[PDB]
Amino acid sequence: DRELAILATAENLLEDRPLADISVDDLAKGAGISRPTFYFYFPSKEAVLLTLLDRVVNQADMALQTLAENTDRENMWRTGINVFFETFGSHKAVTRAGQAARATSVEVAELWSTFMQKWIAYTAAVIDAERDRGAAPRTLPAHELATALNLMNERTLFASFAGEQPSVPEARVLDTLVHIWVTSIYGE
Amino acid sequence: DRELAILATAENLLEDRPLADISVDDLAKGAGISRPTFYFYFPSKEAVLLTLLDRVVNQADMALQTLAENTDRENMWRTGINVFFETFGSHKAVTRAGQAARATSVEVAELWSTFMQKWIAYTAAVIDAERDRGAAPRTLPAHELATALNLMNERTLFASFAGEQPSVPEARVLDTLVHIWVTSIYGE
Ligand SMILES: O=S(=O)(NCCC(F)(F)F)c1ccccc1
Ligand SMILES: O=S(=O)(NCCC(F)(F)F)c1ccccc1
């Protein structure tokens, strides 16, 4: 209600400047409420970012679950990486501010860490199933391969979304990651 | 002289706490000099970190040049990745503080960005030479493949050195990266 208005204002202002340059008064004004009324819904602007990040992370996670509960192996991995490309790619300002807040908020670091562990455990489970069915060779420990591939995707997606130098162009980043996943999972 | 003493004190204190919890007075005391004498050598504690990072980055870069100016393809890539594993792995506190300072220092962000561009251009040149000699297939654009692999290495090395959750164990991180480089460069 007022909560959704605060969250929407925060995501809007984060497209223009960092959390550090946004004040509680900014979030209040944008949401059409007073400062004290803002503090009824959130303890701080930092808690507003944590909620936005939590919604984006849960949206990716729910889309991955939907995929899992339902093509060739290259398209299977592409469809799964694409959940993260589209979800985070649709919320670049929250992605960029959320990643930066990992350095200064234990809650943001622990949220990111919890979901990364889940997504790595899922990637490793799929590699093991591919190994069990005889489609993938038993090369690296599946969990170690999964970890490296998930960290590559974290760094490479986020560098592309932020336009970092260096970065893969956003229009080339899906094909780039899929090639590296498929060759490293199926290759000897 | 006093400069090396300041740099050595800073690298020592960075093994115990972040730059934010180290004062100019701390660096002065450790180096056996006054605060005003410290400011003769460096404008700030931030400039001390930038110099330490610059020395570590140049040490990796010089070791890579030595390798380039001088085994099978898997060992060739392993020896090159190992420059970064050993160099950064030998200076974990400077690595960790330098990476964090990318968020708050334009000079640290631009130093890291300059060397990443150089190391990616070198990786792409080697992939192209492997493609020219008929040892690697023409799959992804070499520069885009190089970018993704260099970013994977940045994120995965630094997560392993910092003991992050998640991370590849430090004792498994070289073999993990080499497998992904070799399969993604030589694989179709
Ligand atoms: O590695 S993933 O593409 N996403 C995790 C990393 C990040 F969130 F993008 F940062 C991935 C994980 C699980 C299944 C398919 C793809
Ligand atoms: O990708 S690399 O291992 N190092 C760049 C990344 C970082 F510095 F480690 F962060 C690499 C680059 C060039 C040749 C061999 C290996």
PDB file of C-alpha atoms and ligand atoms in Angstrom, chain B residues 64 77 80-81 84 88 112 116 119-120 122-123 149-150 153-154 157-158 181, ligand 2:
ATOM      1  CA  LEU B  64      52.784 -12.901 -16.932  1.00  0.00           C
ATOM      2  CA  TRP B  77      46.908 -22.251 -19.214  1.00  0.00           C
ATOM      3  CA  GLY B  80      49.361 -18.588 -16.649  1.00  0.00           C
ATOM      4  CA  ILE B  81      46.374 -18.753 -14.194  1.00  0.00           C
ATOM      5  CA  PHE B  84      47.458 -14.778 -10.477  1.00  0.00           C
ATOM      6  CA  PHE B  88      47.301 -12.433  -5.321  1.00  0.00           C
ATOM      7  CA  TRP B 112      41.890  -2.635 -11.791  1.00  0.00           C
ATOM      8  CA  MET B 116      41.831  -6.426 -16.573  1.00  0.00           C
ATOM      9  CA  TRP B 119      44.946  -9.452 -19.298  1.00  0.00           C
ATOM     10  CA  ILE B 120      41.733 -10.045 -21.347  1.00  0.00           C
ATOM     11  CA  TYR B 122      46.378 -11.089 -23.856  1.00  0.00           C
ATOM     12  CA  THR B 123      44.030 -14.091 -23.204  1.00  0.00           C
ATOM     13  CA  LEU B 149      36.940 -16.353 -18.252  1.00  0.00           C
ATOM     14  CA  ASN B 150      38.961 -13.429 -16.734  1.00  0.00           C
ATOM     15  CA  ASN B 153      38.874 -15.966 -12.347  1.00  0.00           C
ATOM     16  CA  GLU B 154      38.604 -12.533 -10.630  1.00  0.00           C
ATOM     17  CA  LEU B 157      40.062 -16.497  -6.864  1.00  0.00           C
ATOM     18  CA  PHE B 158      39.029 -13.595  -4.612  1.00  0.00           C
ATOM     19  CA  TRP B 181      39.376 -22.580 -19.419  1.00  0.00           C
TER      20      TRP B 181
HETATM   21  O1  LIG C   2      42.050 -14.568 -15.803  1.00  0.00           O
HETATM   22  S1  LIG C   2      43.437 -14.653 -15.267  1.00  0.00           S
HETATM   23  O2  LIG C   2      43.704 -15.869 -14.475  1.00  0.00           O
HETATM   24  N1  LIG C   2      43.892 -13.213 -14.461  1.00  0.00           N
HETATM   25  C1  LIG C   2      42.939 -12.100 -14.669  1.00  0.00           C
HETATM   26  C2  LIG C   2      41.892 -12.075 -13.548  1.00  0.00           C
HETATM   27  C3  LIG C   2      42.435 -11.771 -12.144  1.00  0.00           C
HETATM   28  F1  LIG C   2      43.448 -10.912 -12.151  1.00  0.00           F
HETATM   29  F2  LIG C   2      42.831 -12.910 -11.638  1.00  0.00           F
HETATM   30  F3  LIG C   2      41.470 -11.240 -11.386  1.00  0.00           F
HETATM   31  C4  LIG C   2      44.591 -14.806 -16.633  1.00  0.00           C
HETATM   32  C5  LIG C   2      44.763 -13.731 -17.503  1.00  0.00           C
HETATM   33  C6  LIG C   2      45.707 -13.830 -18.542  1.00  0.00           C
HETATM   34  C7  LIG C   2      46.435 -15.008 -18.709  1.00  0.00           C
HETATM   35  C8  LIG C   2      46.282 -16.049 -17.827  1.00  0.00           C
HETATM   36  C9  LIG C   2      45.351 -15.967 -16.809  1.00  0.00           C
END
